[model samples]
Target: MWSHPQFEKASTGREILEKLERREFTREVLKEALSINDRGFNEALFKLADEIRRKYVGDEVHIRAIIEFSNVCRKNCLYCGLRRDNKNLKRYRMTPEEIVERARLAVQFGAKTIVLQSGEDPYYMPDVISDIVKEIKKMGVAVTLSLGEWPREYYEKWKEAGADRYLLRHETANPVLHRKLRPDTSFENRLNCLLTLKELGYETGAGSMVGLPGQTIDDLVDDLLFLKEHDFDMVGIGPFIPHPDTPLANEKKGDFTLTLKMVALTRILLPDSNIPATTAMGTIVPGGREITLRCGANVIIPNWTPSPYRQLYQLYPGKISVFEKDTASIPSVMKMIELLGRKPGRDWGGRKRVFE
Candidate 1:
């Protein structure tokens, strides 16, 4: 029974849906929506989000392939298993040619976009990455780079080399929590990188995590509001899973229901943007991903990182083995997509810009 001054009484779930659908949001209304825990009410919210998603983004579930090129990072983020201080991690880097070769294999398996992701490893210099991007583009599939923050010139060079998208999750919207979670980089630097990517003509993707150590409902409201205001082409919302090697190892994992609510809320708020039912979702519960897909998500990224390197590039515990269980092959993934009544996206799954 939390109350806001803007609301005289608690708004029903349907009332909140109307507010969101009309794109008439205030901080109070968003906080109200985030606080809804009534099961029946949440069902309506999730259903409306699903309906909006179908009308806006259609039913194509874009299956992007991910290759974790390196696990060696320069930062010591307190939540990630690949933090520089994690001496137990077996670090490895894929050669540029190996990366390109893996991209070729992923394309053969029907992935329309190849996501090149790694830690903040400075090992792959701009020239080497640009070459890899160039070769991957030759295969005629879209290329997405998720390497951690770097100089603006590298983003420009990668764009010139034919990268179509970039994913740099902001992790959290509150400036104080962001700095505390990742002291290696500042909140402003992350925002600058996002804006820089957007300006440089990449279909820039940004995201935030649910249930961080100090996160609150108000913080989640800020994240959803930030995503709406930025209107990023892609949005990735996942539950924060603690890693045993990280400083926050003893903290509780993110709530599954809260994470789903975040995904559905992001969809309702930004209907046209692509939101993935992240692998972290699946890692939490067995059928979590399928439920998320039905809720509002329209994208899935199957890991294509070569097996040896895949196991080592652990951002969160159980990430590597989660994909290994039964979600590997493109055909199998497509089957899952079809079963959910969504088509595996065949074309380069670029953002379907609503404004243009």
Candidate 2:
């Protein structure tokens, strides 16, 4: 269903896809596949990815409603638009009742899962977040949290409250690059949190961005290998888009083609993981989401945050979908699914192990 010309050279890429399907490819081999830029290779790569997805995850395009309830972060990360360094930006946090209400609206709009994302805001109480998670899960929908690092007890508190999953992007595996972006934190601690999430019996997820100031092809391999070795339950990745007021404001955006390649490669390495079509993909290219869905991603997270706060939650510039006043709905998503010959999933979609 790809909107592209068939490639005579597509055979080679498909061959690589076949060899690596359910089998491990060395980092060197993966790096070479990632380096291929020809249409033939891409077409073959994307088509095989679609086939792989169908076999593992089926045709339903799972939808997760993302409610960014807070933008009040204490960290001053360089790539994020919500960094504490932005003086003109106003910080906001939703009430516990308000977060529950957003989750209700998401369910009304047919979202099977609700993802509550906030920055490293220290003020939001753990008890308050646990209440919100409990309320959303009470509605019989899966709940995912994307909060930053916290103590082991904090993670246990949310898990006991019935949160189903946790997503913490590793951002990068390169120790130097990881320190460069998140200067106040360490790579070891971030990964330790992921391990803690898994240890707590949560369906833990982790991912990385495609482009950074000094990231290399080798770094990308480590990223893929990192996800597989960690045994993440879900995976969501996007491109690097620099924000205006951040330290790397004038930096070039990540390569769109390379981003897709990484997604496809991840699916091959971690076939059973639930990968989402990231908003960053749709932002960087005209029909990035549609193409990504066809390639490997089985899920898409539509923004369900109310607009006033939604516009204010800009982690990166050029976010594709946003709501200012109206409540988020499902018809718009169904239309996109139909266009790609996909079905709208009807269950509280969680990760599935193909090996089972």
Candidate 3:
């Protein structure tokens, strides 16, 4: 078991990379990291994460507004509150025009990117999605799609329709664990879908859960390596919050500290990746978003959706439903970003190409 002394004394990027590359980290390292008497060690790791951030990314932080267009889904995931088995939750689907209206509101409030996230509802065809993308593009805002898995043809059509990015979380790299968590879904299909998006010239985004059921530290390390190998443009990692209506409702919540560590680690591994301090982390720890920034997370997706429907789009339990405390309004979100000592950039901060 590697200890804190080893990690604390890691003085170079190569050393830190080697530690992760060696896969020598164990429960002892986590315990030592959590038990550090001197804050210097933790601060050092933060500094390393930040230095890596600056080397790849400048001072700009990307702000994205996600429009949960539909809540109806066919598959049932063990941890999600919006799974098919959840009967108490309400469902809604906005028209293409309604989605465009939300995009305009987000742009008006200074959002550079609009993320259209929804469940896999077959009612909304690819043509309808393409139209929505075209409308949002007319407004000059970059569009990102997160409407579950889709066919390669749909991805190509969306790309042709002006969608710039797509977020499809593999959830876990281990196929067995993924199948256990999402019995109705296929890990192979998700991976193939992401690869197809990349092939179609879209900025690809993928991520996973920290401390998922049957997941190990080795599994988490493998996930980080997977992201590093793929060179994804955007990455998101959050704690596994269980939904009461799901099968894993009784499962213990994910460790916030470990999640933070993984976020920092990801920043080191994929220095240029757009890593967001997810709402799950913020929901678990007060001022967690600020901590995430200190630990190398730069992007924040403030809720821009209206209030009544905001509570209706629950992906996981204990999610910060009403942006009341943090202000769900777009203008208020901008103000909050200013208060946090970060400047919101207008561009999507495209990946570093070979020539560039």
Candidate 4:
């Protein structure tokens, strides 16, 4: 295990949580939280994060079965393996019937929510996705769309088609670096999409990556502030894993421990939101799922894409898609939750505005 650097004396992460309770974190204290790696500091951080998580969200680990329906992407993000510039990857898009059938299977296998995730491939246009969304909702599970940026008109069409949520990660908090890292996309436009999702009555989600090149302590601080500003129903964060075929191929991997710290801090900031222990976390670390859940996360997403197409949907390498085995792996997931002393979440797992 890696060891700690000293932080200015505070009780523990609980004390930091108390300070953050009022939404009044200063740059210095947050700066210390970012730098601190001592035993007491980390212990207390996880301890209090667990307490906050329990008090607000309880032990029900919500599972959203994710189906990666398409690998074709239009954007050329420097960090993503699915970027248009990467020809090493083979592309495929599941037919709408195939996509809905997988979603139906996920619901049948005990998922209360279904996530239809894909790259920014415009082949699945608004009407195409809305039709699929309509079919998936018939199986009685909530539907969330992550098919990249589009106009309000498109969002409204999907909303009318009964999609319950939308996820569009801001990707980074630094505007300059955001522009540099994500070619042909603007930070303003990203924020606008998230805001528009909320206006359209879809429970929206937004987040950032830790350890992206040029990301800093202040940037993370701003991320927490940004989450509060948007007040979305869901938010997610994960380490930036470099993809070989992309521009950041050889860059150092993001700090797992620091990523955990960011997860804990996000809980204190958006106490009522549904935070997931991302698949990327499990890819890089041996027991990343357990680590993230203990810190603050309350949701777990298992892959639901057909097994044959699972490898073709790769956005980053080492992503754990073994859960894509048929029947949604309910017994396996439930066993994991039971081992952690958390029960499988019972309902749609939407955000409880009461806690906020």
What tens digits encode model 1's per-residue C-alpha lDDT throughout 172-210?
989999999999888899999999999999998998888
Q: Could you estimate the TM-score for every candidate? A: 0.94, 0.93, 0.88, 0.93
Per-residue lDDT of 127 in model 2: 84
Candidate 4 lDDT over 36-85, as tens digits, reads: 76767876777767778999999999989999999889898888988999
List runs of model 3 lying over 4 Å from the truth: 1-40, 321-329, 353-356
- lDDT per model vs. reference: 0.88, 0.85, 0.78, 0.84
What ranking emerges by lDDT with the best candidate at the front? Answer: 1, 2, 4, 3
TM-score of 1: 0.94
RMSD to native for every prediction?
Answer: 2.8, 5.4, 4.4, 4.1
Question: What's the residue-level lDDT of 29 in candidate 2?
Answer: 70
Q: Encode model 3's per-residue lDDT on 1-356: one tens digit a residue.
A: 87654433434334444464454444444334433434455566677788777677766777888888888898888888888989988888787787798789887777888999888988886999999999999888889999888888889999999999999987999988988889887789889998999999999889998878888877887787788779888898899987777888888888887788788778876777889878788877887777887788888777765556677888876565542742354565466667877777757656664312
At residue 129, what lDDT does model 2 achieve? 87
lDDT of 2 at 106: 83
